[PDB]
Design a binder for this molecule. Structure first.
Ligand SMILES: Cc1ccc(CO)cc1N(c1ccnc(Nc2cc(N3CCOCC3)cc(S(C)(=O)=O)c2)n1)C(C)C
Ligand SMILES: [Mg+2]
Ligand SMILES: [Mg+2]
Ligand SMILES: [Mg+2]
Length: 270
């Protein structure tokens, strides 16, 4: 679905370095449709091409305001491209670093609510994300946060799947490679911590191995400076060792909505 004629795409600036090629900003103009801004991912073995394009296959089946929208692919022409909606503020971790301390707690909670709604939807579709991290959240001009980074490849036990993201991964997923929506809930807690810390690196003073050891020994990240206690408590709930004890994404959204309804609750900080 959404194969598009390369003649309809005008490539503008190179805006990032992607994991397997350049990231560009461009313009898509198709007959009968208004022109739109697009982000463009470019691409190897046939296995790697099929893994690359698997992102588009799955993205094309999602439709949600907090999930990045697929515009199309260029495959019957080289270089192979994936075109999505353009997200003007780029990745959330770097966006927050650029804007450190400059958004209100209520704004940050709205961002987290958007991400949580995107995850609620993925969980409802039985899609387990496995790499949920602030770097994989994209931000538009109205501060709407959208989940990105999809595909049907597996992590490295060469495939474009990547290494397991230790700092974002639930202990049972690291130990047993059992990835579920409950392990995504653990990652979501890490994302909450990243957002409330304006894009600080999780466990910034620890190696990947130190993090594995720490979590096994009951260490959990502390509240970021100025972080409402209620938000930190929700993080701790997401980081329960027993995956079945973690909140599900509908409960995550509902908890954030209650905070938004009752903003005085956000004034309590440790
Ligand atoms: C194109 C694409 C396809 C698939 C996926 C994963 O699902 C993601 C994307 N990408 C998209 C999709 C939609 N919007 C964007 N916007 C974007 C904007 C900026 N800039 C905006 C201006 O300020 C500087 C930053 C920088 C980046 S990046 C690549 O450096 O993270 C991305 N990027 C990239 C993340 C590869
Ligand atoms: Mg829908
Ligand atoms: Mg991934
Ligand atoms: Mg990834």
């Amino acid at each position: 679905a959404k194969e598009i004629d390369v003649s309809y795409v005008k490539i503008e600036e190179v805006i990032g370095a992607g994991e397997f090629g350049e990231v560009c900003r461009g313009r898509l103009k198709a007959p009968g449709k208004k022109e739109s801004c697009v982000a463009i991912k470019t691409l190897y073995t046939e296995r790697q091409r099929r893994e690359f394009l698997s992102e588009a296959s799955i993205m094309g089946q999602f439709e949600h305001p907090n999930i990045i929208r697929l515009e199309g692919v260029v495959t019957n022409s080289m270089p192979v491209m994936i075109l999505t909606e353009f997200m003007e503020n780029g990745a959330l971790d770097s966006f927050l670093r650029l804007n450190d301390g400059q958004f209100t707690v209520i704004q940050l909670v709205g961002m987290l609510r958007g991400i949580a709604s995107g995850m609620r939807y993925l969980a409802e579709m039985s899609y387990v994300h496995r790499d949920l991290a602030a770097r994989n959240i994209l931000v538009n001009s109205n501060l709407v946060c959208k989940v990105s980074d999809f595909g049907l490849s597996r992590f490295l036990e060469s495939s474009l799947g990547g290494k397991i993201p230790i700092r974002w991964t639930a202990p049972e997923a690291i130990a047993f490679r059992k990835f579920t929506s409950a392990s995504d809930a653990w990652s979501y807690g890490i994302v909450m911590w990243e957002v409330m810390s304006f894009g600080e690196r999780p466990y910034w003073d620890m190696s990947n191995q130190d993090v594995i050891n720490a979590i096994e020994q009951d260490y959990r990240l502390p509240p970021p400076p100025d972080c409402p206690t209620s938000l930190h408590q929700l993080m701790l709930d997401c980081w329960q060792k027993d995956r079945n004890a973690r909140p599900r994404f509908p409960q995550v959204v509902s908890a954030l909505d209650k905070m938004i309804r009752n903003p005085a609750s956000l004034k309590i900080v440790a």
